[PDB]
Design a protein around this nucleic acid. Structure first.
Lengths: 96, 98, 895, 89, 92, 96, 106, 85, 97
DNA sequence: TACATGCACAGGATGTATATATCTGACACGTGCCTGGAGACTAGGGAGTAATCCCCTTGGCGGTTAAAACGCGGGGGACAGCGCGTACGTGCGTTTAAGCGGTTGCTAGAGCTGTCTACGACCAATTGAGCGGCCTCGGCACCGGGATTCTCCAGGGCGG
DNA sequence: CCGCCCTGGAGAATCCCGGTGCCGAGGCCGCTCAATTGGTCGTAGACAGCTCTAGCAACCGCTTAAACGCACGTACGCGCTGTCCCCCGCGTTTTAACCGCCAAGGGGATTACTCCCTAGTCTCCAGGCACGTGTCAGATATATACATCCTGTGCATGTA
């Protein structure tokens, strides 16, 4: 069961495009959410489903942004995504 | 006389009386016609049936007997027109198309 | 099943299958596992000179040799290799990582003169600990199975599946039996007894709807080989046995130090060796106490087959494969091989499916206050178990409210009592005092409590002293601003508005302990009292003065140091312990620290460094709830409760770390309370609880069977028994225990044995009269073909050997010496069959019997493992030849 | 040494680890990833969250509450063109 | 007493796939979907009535809002479903 | 018969212009753009306040809904100066 | 008497017209008394914000009348008005002069 | 009922497309851009005109007004100021 | 004779058309295109002249904003010439097609 | 003549697939109630229809000139190829912290019942603010004639 | 003696100033509808009290897989070079967009009048939610008949 060299990335793409679980770990993400919310109001409480909804939405957003970033990389005749590809994708979407 | 539901008079499964009550209380106009809730309940039932048929086919193609959010995602993103209607929408625990 | 609605929309069909395969992308070892220790010379030391400097990695490679644990070995195969010797193999990076820290870095620190001698000796002690641990891996602990494997042209040597002392079942390995018996024969002996044992779960008396009348006794039973069972320990066994006979479930509630583990082990011994209830018993304990349980079963009940069920997934699979059932491979329902199983709370939740589907006969839960909540996962997992009797062992049956005691009782008696009311000391009506009397009377027949003072009187008394100390100026400022939610003053000196007012009680306690628990309080003080105090000894003033408790604590410490006393300081917050560990660092006192971040390896190091006779440590900072119940600091004398607890038992357990059996001084306790704060609401609420516990607890098939009818299978069993042991009149209960003979009375077996020998004697008499007419089988109760002559002559053979060995070499059956005259040898067998082989065969028929040749072959105590070839080069000896050779050797011995 | 100073702790944005960002790029179908991507991605996420939370907290303060609920997040997402299904009940 | 569309979604499922179930998370997604399209259609018909200086939302407004909101073939079949239902309701 | 009247914001836009630039004029097309701007912002604020009242099961649109909608729709410093302007107007109105 | 609510709030925008438009737009069943005043104050603030910048842009071109070009310049040069009107087309407005540096001659 | 119009996408000449690209800041233009942009423009116009004719038919009119176009644009997220409303 | 170098007149025209505000497509051809597209939805339609003008303002704004994104995509690939694949990438990332 | 190892054979003990009683979990049936939907009737305004006006959309014509079409030379930029060097992926050993289970008391908030008042809807009478119509004269657009600013290429000078 | 770089100038394009004349921006006026005032009345929402559950802070313990640090090799990105394709700049011809005028008439807007469809109100009951229970098919352990197989005994040749 010896795989070829250079096939680890393709197997990971096939693995993570089949599953549906969240890919960020819950405890770190929740700490981040509370730190950001601290700057708008002090002593806030969160329902557990509010943090779950935030995580679902933020990961959907990042995955859909990596698809456009990949298209920008293939346009420049590369296979490696770079920060300039994220910046192009976000400026054409109308965020920058 | 004995009361017949307004949804059975139109041959529908979706509730015509509840759709009428939601139109009257959503500040959509000063008045609501009699055929407006019937027409709207028929359209809601049609779109529900369109999605559920494709989602049950997807659950059968993966050897399952129960629809989960993954099957709804597959059904929507594979249909061109349903994908257009739900283009700016995120289904939770739905995944992506391979 | 036929759809009545379709879509007329003309969209193309889609294949929704998302299952993929990675096959299109396609086109157990012997390496270093562990590095135990090294040696100064790789070969010979040509010169001890140039001891200065620290060696380089290349220098270590050409100057040392290492003791290497090899993969797929078993520590007994550890060899001394060199970088050059092994050369290149897997795990070489592990060897480099060893050289980096144990040789290079370690010598580096020993060359620096800034390291005190007390640190050098610590490193020497630590190295000693490491190697002392690596020694325990050679010692075998338990033999699991034995197979007759065939080596590469190595005939069929015997291999023992050995588990090692400080390792799990994923580390158990096969070993050559000849070396195992040389290493530890006692465990080989235990494996022998456990192999053919009488105590088996399938052969237990089914006491159903009627149990024998227990007799209260006053004699330490003979099947309790441990030692001198105390009187208060003997009392508990009678209590538990009475409760079992009636069909009830109790609670052992003694205080610590009275040996609650010994009493329950001895009770299981009684439950097996008396009422013959030796089915699967289960004992659920905390992990930290699992060692002390195991050795207890190893000392006070060495005959019981007790197994420990814990470890990783692979290690727990090994146990189920080799030690659960008598025959695992059989497709039909499997039996049970063990008597007692020991597990922890973690695996009751992990493997509830593999463990709940067992007909247990007795459950014992240690530290049962873990079950004080009927909505926990452990509670709902242990109630789904199909167990007959139960028992809980807890030193604190009730701690906070009365719902905890209700949950414990509903675990024992699901429906008997109904404790659905809570005591309130506010109403105090006559009906409530009646409720207290009612419950205190109804639960008494199910709780056995004893005290460390009512028995074992040699114990110095403990006295508690409460001290109320008022707040300071910074403390009063913070307490005021928090009590009014004045965000502005609290956030004027804050780094990002970090002052959170969620949970106000928590903030009032942080203020009542030390203002430095809040952020930037260090900046307000020091700068606003002695601006420019960036030097030490002036910062110490900031610590000691900014808190009302720091003042009283500092005075107490200076007073207590000159007297001959040691201090244990307990706190709820580990951040307060950081502040205390800084006050003691600037002062210059030597202290130890144990909280929830200190790993278990460093904890015992700390505890022993504190209890050493030449210990420069003065105080021990302790988290109140950390460590568990096993910590023992009896050398200390004073206990300072810095922060109180909502649960009074949590502070009593912190006092018991110095006031235990073995304490030889008067223990003095100092509570620190801040007056006119929320701290006083804790003590008061604690006191109520301390009174409630003193008011409720601390006041005192398709075919039917038969009975003794002998059938065809019973006669064939007695005939094969007369073909082996023969004279079994004095060994009838034994064969009926291991399941050889069916469940019949020993009287009927003796009657049928007399009838058997009489029918055989009459057969040989008729054969005698039928052999001299012109100059041997007889049916008994249906069983045809029964050799009378051979059987009676075999009876005389076995009786001759018995009266030749039961009085000669009784206390040593192995140490046996045949006569000086030697019978003629065999007919040239495939082995070197000398006289010692004949003597060992004579002992084998005595221990394992006749016909059982596979048992005689598999026993390294004789030394004929590879000399007999019954079945797997067709060898000369055999099952008929060994029997004829015994009948020839014994006939040579008779004359 | 210095034990009372509750510092020397990793930042919360760094809890979005590099393996997590790589899994997210894999679900998007990316093959190779630059080393400078990981600090870029953290900056993007942090902006996204700041826009949603600012709106949800507004919806929470209008209702006179102190608890951010799931409906606050659903409304905040809906009003910036990112409708989410599955939590609205 | 949450008041959702769960039992009606279930009745429709038993017409398209009689031998298929649905999980609870999927049922909540279908509930969000029916609420979303209700709001879109009713809002668009509200604006159609305001543009034309009318006070009533009639079947004609619902038909035009369906033609504006659904793409292509979905709109054709939804219009015929609605028309058939109003015709059956009236002649009854 | 009679040319029906048509309401616009032109006279009020002209008053504000004469307060900010007393000597500047405006053309017909730019005045039409300003009228469209006022109507668009009105629709946005009033629609968000309507939704706010529905989410909280209220039957009234109050100045709290207008304030919350202004905070949701305007970005940054525009929102701060707008809420101060609105609060000042309601204070002057109520004290009269 | 006879006194407009605009003069009572100190405003130029019509409070009574805004109240009428709230009651007839189907936004709720009832409309509070301070909601028209607040909303009219906000609309007046935003109008003054854009007209100030448009008059400045008209001065930079030596003009005394505001034309759509000046509203476009005002909006697209202010960072917060550009975000409020990010998806709005101003007719006869043009674009901002902006050439990428890669295209300039070297 | 008037005549039939045909081949009017070619009235969007190459010079006009170059002027539109110059206002976008484009310095150099491939020769395949002209047919590509004609296709993009035709798709955009089909969407807007479909929605505007829907609005016109609902009002039972025969003339497409400027408010119909403004509403058709607004509902696609492309608000236009300066034509009423 | 005199000739300007390639790219000089192009930059001059970028400056000319980024200062003006007039429509860049001829009015009569655009009106014929609008009417031809509309006759495939309903026959015998009439148009207000301001309706055609609104359609032209919106069409030109859409095309100019699309050429800005197309120019960014061409520079990203280290070119100065825009090509059909740049329009396709920009439209795919916007979410159109 | 008699004792002992080698050999062939007979026959029951243990292993296996099958029918059967038992346990169990989802499915279908029955209960209740209560609240929201249906039936009935009335008033009144919104929506529909007809007749009329008038404006603004479509169509035609004819001239003019700006813009588009087209041809062509050539410059530069697209593109393919090649070589290098370093950053990215992979593996392997070690640490760390997430996930899970748990404590203890307090508070926020939802849901329910119930009271009560201030506020906003509604109406009639009044009146003044804003709209449509009319008019005029100034900011802006266009034109023309220079002034100047910018692009580009060839020649002279200067350094290598 | 050669190569490159600076500059000088010529010409094209753009800016600037003055003059003209136009047509819409801004003011005035009459009136007429919508905003204002004043009064009545009902209910929305605020407040209260009470019960039950989640969330929070700051600790504890255990297991295990993930995160991380480092060593190293090679695959990819990037830079340079040459070629040749194709787009730009510009001049000459062709075509059709635009402007101004005119006319017809189609349809949208307005007005008057009618009638029918929806809100409001009130009575009454069953549809949907929560709950409990009888039932049947599937999974499962077990008795049972059938079947393959290891095993132990009597006959036979060889040695004493």
């Amino acid at each position: 069961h010896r795989y070829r060299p250079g096939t680890v990335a393709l197997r990971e793409i096939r693995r993570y495009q089949k599953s549906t679980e969240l890919l960020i770990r819950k405890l770190p993400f929740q700490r981040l959410v509370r730190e950001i919310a601290q700057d708008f109001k002090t002593d806030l409480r969160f329902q557990s489903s509010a943090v779950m909804a935030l995580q679902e939405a933020s990961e959907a957003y990042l995955v859909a942004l990596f698809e456009d970033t990949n298209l920008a990389a293939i346009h420049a005749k590369r296979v490696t995504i770079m920060p300039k590809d994220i910046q192009l994708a976000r400026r054409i979407r109308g965020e920058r | 006389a004995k009361a017949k539901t307004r949804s059975s008079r139109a041959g529908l499964q979706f509730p015509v009386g509840r759709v009428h009550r939601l139109l009257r209380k959503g500040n959509y106009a000063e008045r609501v016609g009699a055929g407006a809730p019937v027409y709207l309940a028929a359209v809601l039932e049609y779109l529900t049936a369109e999605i559920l048929e494709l989602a049950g086919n997807a659950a059968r193609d993966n050897k399952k007997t129960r629809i989960i959010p993954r099957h709804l995602q597959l059904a929507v993103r594979n249909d061109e027109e349903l994908n257009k209607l739900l283009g700016r929408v995120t289904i939770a625990q739905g995944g992506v198309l391979p | 099943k036929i759809p009545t609605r379709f879509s007329n929309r003309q969209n193309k069909t889609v294949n929704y299958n998302i299952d993929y395969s990675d096959d299109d992308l396609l086109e157990d070892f012997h390496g270093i596992d562990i590095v135990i220790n090294h040696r100064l010379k790789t070969s010979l030391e040509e010169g001890k000179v140039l001891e200065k400097t620290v060696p380089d990695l290349n220098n270590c490679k050409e100057n040392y040799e290492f003791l290497i644990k090899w993969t797929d070995e078993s520590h007994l195969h550890n060899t001394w290799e060199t970088y050059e010797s092994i050369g290149q193999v897997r795990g070489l990076k592990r060897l480099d990582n060893y050289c980096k820290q144990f040789i290079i870095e370690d010598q580096q620190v020993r060359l620096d003169p800034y390291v005190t001698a007390e640190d050098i000796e610590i490193m020497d002690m630590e190295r000693e600990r490491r190697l002392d641990e690596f020694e325990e891996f050679h010692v075998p602990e338990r033999i699991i199975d034995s197979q007759r494997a065939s080596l590469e042209d190595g005939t069929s040597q015997l291999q023992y599946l050995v588990k090692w002392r400080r390792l799990n079942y994923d580390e158990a390995t096969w070993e050559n039996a000849t070396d195992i018996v040389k290493l530890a024969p006692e465990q080989v002996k235990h494996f022998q007894n456990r192999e053919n044992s009488k105590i088996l779960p399938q052969y237990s008396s089914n006491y159903t709807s009627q149990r024998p009348r227990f007799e209260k006794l006053s004699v330490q039973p003979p099947f309790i080989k441990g030692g001198e069972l105390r009187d208060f320990q003997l009392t508990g066994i009678n209590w538990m046995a009475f409760l079992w006979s009636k069909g009830d479930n109790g609670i052992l509630a003694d205080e610590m130090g009275l040996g609650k583990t010994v009493q329950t082990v001895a009770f299981i011994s009684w439950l097996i060796f008396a009422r013959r209830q030796n089915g699967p018993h289960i004992i659920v304990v905390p992990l930290s106490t699992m060692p002390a349980w195991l050795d207890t079963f190893e000392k006070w009940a060495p005959d019981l087959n007790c197994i420990c069920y814990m470890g990783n997934q692979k290690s727990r699979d090994t146990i189920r494969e080799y030690e659960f059932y008598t025959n695992p491979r059989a497709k039909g329902k499997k039996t049970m091989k063990f008597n007692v199983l020991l597990t922890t709370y973690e695996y009751i939740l992990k493997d509830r499916a593999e463990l709940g589907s067992i007909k247990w006969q007795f459950m014992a839960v240690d530290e049962a206050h873990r079950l004080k909540n009927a909505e926990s996962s452990l509670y709902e997992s242990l109630n789904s178990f199909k167990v007959a009797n139960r028992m809980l062992i807890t030193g604190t049956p009730l701690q906070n409210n009365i719902k905890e005691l209700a949950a414990l009782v509903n675990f024992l008696m699901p429906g008997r009592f109904t404790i659905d009311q809570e005591i309130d000391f506010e109403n105090q009506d006559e009906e409530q005092e009646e409720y207290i009397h009612d419950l205190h009377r109804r639960i008494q027949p199910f709780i056995l409590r004893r005290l460390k003072k009512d028995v074992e009187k040699s114990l110095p008394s403990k006295t508690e002293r409460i001290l109320r100390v008022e707040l300071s100026d910074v403390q009063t400022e913070y307490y005021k601003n928090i009590l009014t939610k004045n965000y502005s003053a609290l956030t004027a000196g804050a780094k990002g508005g970090h002052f959170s007012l969620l949970n106000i009680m928590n903030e009032l306690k942080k203020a009542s302990n030390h203002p430095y628990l809040f952020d930037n309080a260090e900046e307000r003080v020091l700068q606003k009292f002695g601006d420019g105090k960036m030097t030490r000894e002036n910062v110490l003033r900031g610590l000691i003065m900014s808190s009302g408790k720091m003042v009283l604590l500092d005075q107490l410490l200076t007073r207590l140091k000159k007297d001959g006393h040691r201090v244990l300081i307990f706190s709820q917050m580990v951040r307060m312990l950081d502040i205390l560990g800084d006050y003691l660092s600037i002062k210059g006192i030597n202290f130890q620290r144990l909280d929830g971040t200190v790993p278990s390896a460093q904890r015992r190091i700390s505890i022993d460094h504190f209890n050493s006779p030449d210990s420069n440590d003065f105080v021990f900072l302790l988290s109140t709830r950390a460590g568990g119940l096993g910590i023992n600091l009896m050398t200390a004398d004073t206990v300072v409760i810095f922060d109180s607890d909502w649960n009074p038992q949590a502070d009593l357990q912190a006092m018991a770390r110095a006031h235990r059996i073995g304490q030889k001084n008067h223990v003095m306790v100092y509570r620190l309370v801040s007056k006119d704060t929320v701290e006083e609401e804790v003590l008061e609420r604690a006191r109520k609880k301390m009174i409630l516990e003193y008011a409720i607890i601390s006041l005192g098939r398709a075919r039917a069977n038969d009975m003794d009818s002998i059938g065809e299978s019973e006669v064939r069993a007695l005939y094969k028994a007369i073909l082996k042991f023969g004279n079994l009149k004095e060994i009838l209960d034994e064969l009926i225990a291991d399941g050889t003979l069916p469940v019949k009375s020993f009287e009927k077996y003796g009657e049928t044995y007399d009838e058997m020998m009489e029918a055989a004697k009459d057969c040989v008499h008729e054969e005698e009269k039928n052999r001299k007419e012109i100059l041997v089988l007889f049916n008994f109760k249906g069983v045809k073909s029964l050799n009378a002559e051979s059987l009676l002559s075999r009876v005389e053979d076995l009786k001759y050997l018995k009266n030749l060995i039961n009085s000669n070499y009784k206390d040593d059956p192995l140490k046996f010496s045949l006569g000086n005259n030697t019978p003629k040898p065999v007919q040239n067998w495939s082995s070197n069959w000398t006289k010692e082989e004949d003597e060992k065969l004579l002992i084998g028929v005595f221990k394992y019997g006749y016909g059982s040749w596979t048992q005689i072959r598999d026993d390294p105590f004789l030394g004929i493992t590879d000399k007999i070839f019954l079945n797997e080069s067709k060898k000369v000896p055999g099952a008929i030849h060994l029997g004829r050779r015994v009948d020839y050797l014994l006939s040579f011995l008779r004359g | 040494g210095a034990k009372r100073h509750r510092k020397v702790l990793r930042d919360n944005i760094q809890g979005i680890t590099k393996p997590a960002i790589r899994r997210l790029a894999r679900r998007g179908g990316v093959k190779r990833i630059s080393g400078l991507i990981y600090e870029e991605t953290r900056g993007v996420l942090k902006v996204f969250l700041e826009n949603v939370i600012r709106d949800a907290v507004t919806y929470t303060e209008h209702a006179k509450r102190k608890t951010v609920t799931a409906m606050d997040v659903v409304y905040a997402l809906k009003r910036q063109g990112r409708t989410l299904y599955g939590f609205g009940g | 007493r949450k008041e959702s569309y769960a039992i009606y979604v279930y009745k429709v499922l038993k017409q398209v796939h009689p031998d298929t179930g649905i999980s609870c998370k999927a049922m909540s997604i279908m509930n969000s979907f029916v609420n979303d399209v209700f709001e879109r259609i009713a809002g668009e018909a509200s604006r159609l009535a305001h543009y034309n200086k009318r006070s009533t939302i009639t079947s004609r407004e619902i038909q035009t809002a369906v033609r504006l909101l659904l793409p292509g073939e979905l709109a054709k079949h939804a219009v015929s479903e609605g028309t058939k239902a109003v015709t059956k309701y009236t002649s009854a």
